[PDB]
Symmetry: C3
Subunit: 236 residues, 3 copies
């Protein structure tokens, strides 16, 4: 069927190549998994720089008998990890802290410069002893580069992931995903800068709650086209 197949091939190529267009978004899905198997996904998109910033209050599992906990209640629990004996808790809040964090990156990403910073519970640079004096961005460990794990993007050649296991303490997150400009053109240079600046931080973020991973796969990953890897190394 020469021309119906040609037409199919062109439609495939148009979908596969679309992310490399000027103003086509790079895509970031962050998934937090909790001990009982619930998943919280946070989606961020931008063509130029994704800035995926998540407070530690926003990373806790926050549902309680069908009701959403307040930032105040969640921050009260987190404080006990930040500042010794700063709350009244006599048992940990490990049940609501992520077991694991998954970062799914898709599109025309500069993989040399994508930065994923797991920061401490109140947003300071992670360290044994956090302090306003030693608080910075883009620490060397944040640049994952070839530590990102290739995943199928079904023809895009443009999806990778990074996984991290937490050890029972709350964290915040700062991810910076910059656009691949390795074609030699600096989109920030010359008159185009005003247009690039106008496009930063323009796309709504979306937070979703799932009672388990299959729900996450069925109603997020496979609905929109982000391949994810489960604990058995099976892709969905």
């Amino acid at each position: 069927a020469d021309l119906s197949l040609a037409r199919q091939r062109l439609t495939d190529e148009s979908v596969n190549e679309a992310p490399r267009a000027y103003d086509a978004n790079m895509e970031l899905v962050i998934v937090a998994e909790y001990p009982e198997g619930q998943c919280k996904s946070f989606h961020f998109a931008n063509p130029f720089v994704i800035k995926g910033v998540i407070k530690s209050s926003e990373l806790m599992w926050d549902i309680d008998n069908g009701h959403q906990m307040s930032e105040y209640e969640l921050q009260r629990s987190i404080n006990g990890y930040a500042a010794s004996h700063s709350n009244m808790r006599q048992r940990s809040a490990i049940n609501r802290i992520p077991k694991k964090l998954s970062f799914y990156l898709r599109g025309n990403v500069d993989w040399n410069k994508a930065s994923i910073d797991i920061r401490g519970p109140t947003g300071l640079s992670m360290r044994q002893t956090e302090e306003y004096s030693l608080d910075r961005i883009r620490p060397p460990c944040s640049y994952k580069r070839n530590k990102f794990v290739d995943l199928p993007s079904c023809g895009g050649r443009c999806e990778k992931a990074w996984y991290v296991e937490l050890d029972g303490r709350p964290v915040s997150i700062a991810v910076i995903v910059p656009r691949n400009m390795h074609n030699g053109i600096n989109l920030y240079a010359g008159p185009l800068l005003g247009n690039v600046i106008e496009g930063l931080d323009t796309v709504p973020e979306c937070t979703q709650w799932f009672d388990n991973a299959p729900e996450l796969y069925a109603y997020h990953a496979s609905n929109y086209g982000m391949t994810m890897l489960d604990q058995f190394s099976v892709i969905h």
Copy 2:
């Protein structure tokens, strides 16, 4: 009264011309109207680029017997529109979805480049079949230009509106309103760039809830000076 009238005229001109000053804000009021007549207004301001980003959870009517619904409850309802059978609802959530969206723009706006993007329920570019691959900003349809409707600004010569009717599904919003630089000066060029960047994203957003449109007119529009048009084509 030559000089008391001269003084009046100068005071009029100073108020009327103020938006054209460097660091004077352009103003964006987005109003969502719901079936029972409630209005939710979202106000954004900036001198250089207004970025008016609204999640679909933030656009639902979220009050319930005097109590505000959680993002979680609202997002649970919206999911059924995004992902087939992703929630347990047996009836629609049309009662809490906007009937209509109104966008009021006032100030020294570049009307050739102002962009209003009605995006899908989870923030992806609107299309019959939304997907991470075909997710972008500043789609051609977003530039309204002469589809904006002139409204009185009482001497500013600087207010226009755009209206859109929804059809029962939830949406998110991304608006970019850039400053008119048609006097030939690029505020992003040379040393002034650092100062322009310092001014982006500095003004608090304000969300207001009204049980009906007259409340919206009385306690928002006429209080601060944004002319609005009702369903009978009367200005307030």
Copy 3:
């Protein structure tokens, strides 16, 4: 002990000087104090420009019998201050409005250009009669300069504060803290601009609630290294 003291001195200098590094954050703590002595702290950090924006709903004391009030309830109270008879209240909401606002700035700050704008209840420039026409940023009064009060930073030579007393009406806040580039190098110039832009707005904000000031000192100030001054002029 020549070399153990040399080692101590070098460790002191490394902590004291760290904020002057490229990508080292400037730090902003805003503290609101309320009539019964509760404190709400808001922490913002960035290397290049801190943009510390706080809605008037976010500045009210919002805890009520251990539960967090909704933005809707808080905004309903604030509206009565913005727009005469726009709510049903027969008594003021002074109990939940700050008595006083404290701004703590630490790091490599340009003290000539740091701007602190106490804006009106709905985000407009503060004035007797607020209006969309006379809404701007960086008003002359916002530049505090030598009105900032030096505080000990324990070797950094880099902490200052500004204090303001409110008079029973709600306000919003916009603070811009730009990086000291008085070494003669414009970090926005040339190829480094893309990297500076990638770093803006990347660090999680953190809101904390304290029942009294000693809690604020014990579990925030002294935990992380921000010196604060109490009503008796004692530093903590």
